[PDB]
């Protein structure tokens, strides 16, 4: 029964809309 957190605007890995990205070990969307 895992829980969830309110979504925040963290995907912005930059400092001025520089789209840096399109976390322990590696992982990709889905399982591959």
């Amino acid at each position: 029964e895992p829980k969830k957190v309110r979504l925040a605007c963290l995907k912005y890995y930059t400092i001025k809309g520089d789209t840096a990205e399109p976390a322990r070990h590696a992982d990709r969307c889905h399982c591959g």
Binding site: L7, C9, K11, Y12, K16, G17, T19
Partner: protein
């Protein structure tokens, strides 16, 4: 307003607009809101890449299929990926 209903038969949400604004899969953009960090993100991402702003945030809830008929819900979005 008229044929848009044909299209819905498009996306809404930050997690699904970004995922279609970039990679140039999008179409047209219509901003809104509450916080700049959600206004000057896309707009700046609109600065790179179409970019438009619709007068009201509610009609998006209306134009889109976020209702059941009676309970329109606001929802800013800017990705017309389908555009069939």
């Amino acid at each position: 307003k008229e044929t848009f209903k044909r299209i819905h038969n498009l996306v809404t949400g930050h997690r699904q607009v970004f995922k279609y604004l970039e990679r140039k899969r999008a179409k047209i953009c219509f901003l809104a809101c509450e916080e700049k960090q959600y206004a000057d993100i896309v707009e700046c991402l609109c600065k790179e890449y179409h970019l438009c702003k619709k007068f009201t945030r509610r009609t998006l809830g209306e134009l889109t299929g976020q209702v059941r008929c009676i309970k329109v819900v606001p929802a800013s979005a800017c990705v017309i990926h389908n555009f069939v």
